[PDB]
Swiss-Prot record, chain A:
Subunit structure: Heterodimer. Interacts with PRP8 (via RNase H homology domain and MPN domain), competing with BRR2 for the same binding site. Component of a U5 snRNP complex that contains at least the U5 snRNA, PRP8, SNU114, AAR2, SMB1, SMD1, SMD2, SMD3, SME1, SMX2 and SMX3, but is not a component of the U4/U6-U5 tri-snRNP complex.
Post-translational modification, as annotated: Phosphorylated on serine and tyrosine residues.
Family that this chain belongs to: Belongs to the AAR2 family.
This protein's name: A1 cistron-splicing factor AAR2
Other notes: Present with 7330 molecules/cell in log phase SD medium.
Residues with PTM Phosphoserine: S236
Swiss-Prot record, chain B:
Effect the entry attributes to changing R105K: Severely impaired growth. Reduced growth at 30 degrees Celsius. Strongly reduced growth at 16 degrees Celsius
Name of the protein: Pre-mRNA-splicing factor 8
Record localization: Nucleus
Lineage of origin: Eukaryota, Fungi, Dikarya, Ascomycota, Saccharomycotina
Note: Present with 468 molecules/cell in log phase SD medium.
The species this protein was found in: Saccharomyces cerevisiae (strain ATCC 204508 / S288c) (Baker's yeast)
Name of the gene encoding the protein in the UniProt record: PRP8
Amino acid sequence: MNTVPFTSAPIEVTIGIDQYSFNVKENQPFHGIKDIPIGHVHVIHFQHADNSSMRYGYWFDCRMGNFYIQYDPKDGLYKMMEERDGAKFENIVHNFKERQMMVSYPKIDEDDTWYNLTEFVQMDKIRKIVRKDENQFSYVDSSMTTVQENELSDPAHSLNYTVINFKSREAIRPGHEMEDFLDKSYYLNTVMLQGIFKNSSNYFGELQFAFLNAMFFGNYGSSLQWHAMIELICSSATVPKHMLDKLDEILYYQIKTLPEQYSDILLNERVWNICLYSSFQKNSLHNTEKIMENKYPELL
Amino acid sequence: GAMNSSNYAELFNNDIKLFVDDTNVYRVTVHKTFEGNVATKAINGCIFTLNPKTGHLFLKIIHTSVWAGQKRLSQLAKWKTAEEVSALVRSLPKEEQPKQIIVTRKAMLDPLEVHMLDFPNIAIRPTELRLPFSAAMSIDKLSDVVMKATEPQMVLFNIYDDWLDRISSYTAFSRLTLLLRALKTNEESAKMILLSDPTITIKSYHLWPSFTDEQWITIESQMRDLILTEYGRKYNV
Ligand SMILES: COc1cc(CN)ccc1C
Ligand SMILES: COc1cc(CN)ccc1C
């Protein structure tokens, strides 16, 4: 188990850690989160009480370094940093642990939610989407745009998701116009899987990361990317059997975790009705269809 | 964007554009089989591709053999249309390629856009105008070349005959659409109107009769009376 120590909490803020949120009051004696499960990426995120504008946060893996959070009164936000002095870090963390100034990540022993949302998410692949390579952690926020959104504006502060565009020369082979538009298998299997992502684990990792960023930050372009990546699979007549099964699992736990009250702005009615009812894979996502119908039947 | 009554003069400016109509691409007769089920027999069809400024009509004849062994023919027809329009643009010198292609039915937008990804500067647009281009097969010379064809074939016409010598393209288009609307609402009457005077003939190199200016006004009036007549017979007004 690992720890993220906080210098202090000078401004009132809601703190989230993966799928959990808690409130810290202005100048309350808060000095971090402990008992963070080693083995998974994590995200620690923030919404200021005095300005719900800009949700922001940091993707990180405790195995890659000792990180902490300090408020920056010039830039006005809680920043992640790395202490390279290990001795100093253990010393800092043990005093706050002894004064019980740290809340405990509530890692229930009967719960696999976080694993199931991050199964294919690895820091190495996150750092290719979010470019800021002087740090071992990655900052995301509500308003960061995607490379595709810039095409349609700072490239340093962008989310470098893989662009998916069904009416593009990459998606459509000359001479197979109708075939490749109505059956996306070429684009999914040869262009994206074999050519760009290399395997389905990297493709699912980007998918899962796009959902998490949509949900935790309300990042609109991440939400477009998640829906695009689903639709490409569902709109392909030929998909490996193991990807369809794993996709059904991925989506089931995303749908299960989505707040009911965010369903109107996080779920695209067109994509989901197409995917579950019209597409080639309409019958291939049993778990996801069953949860969608019992949870969000309005949308369908 | 969509083409409508507000930007109607854009059709007749000096930016090359084509209308594409696919109504008559896939044509069938429906008949009972010996066992009393129903089956279709396809007949020859055509793509109607028209420069509304010049009157140049690129009539691509669609021979029934292009459907042989194919499934979902109504859907294939939109893509076959888009393939043939793309082929036409590619066959034209650069300075003759259209800057815009306007499809008369919105179902043509994706198939054409996909076939023309190579031409990102050509705008593919729908229109809110209800154009009567489906009646193009009521023009005897066009119907004849379509039905006689034994192979795929493209035939080129000027659907304005020589009118542009005397009127603007705006007026020639207005004449054409009223003629086609009339043939679409009551074909027999429209043809009766067009030929009742044997002293006005159709030149071998033309589609419509050689009416004088004065006779065109009369003809136009009679066609409007016909469209109004039929509206009356239809709705009982
Ligand atoms: C919150 O923990 C730390 C604080 C400082 C300096 N505020 C340095 C390093 C660490 C670990
Ligand atoms: C108080 O700290 C926590 C609280 C909850 C539930 N609001 C979840 C997780 C943590 C760390």
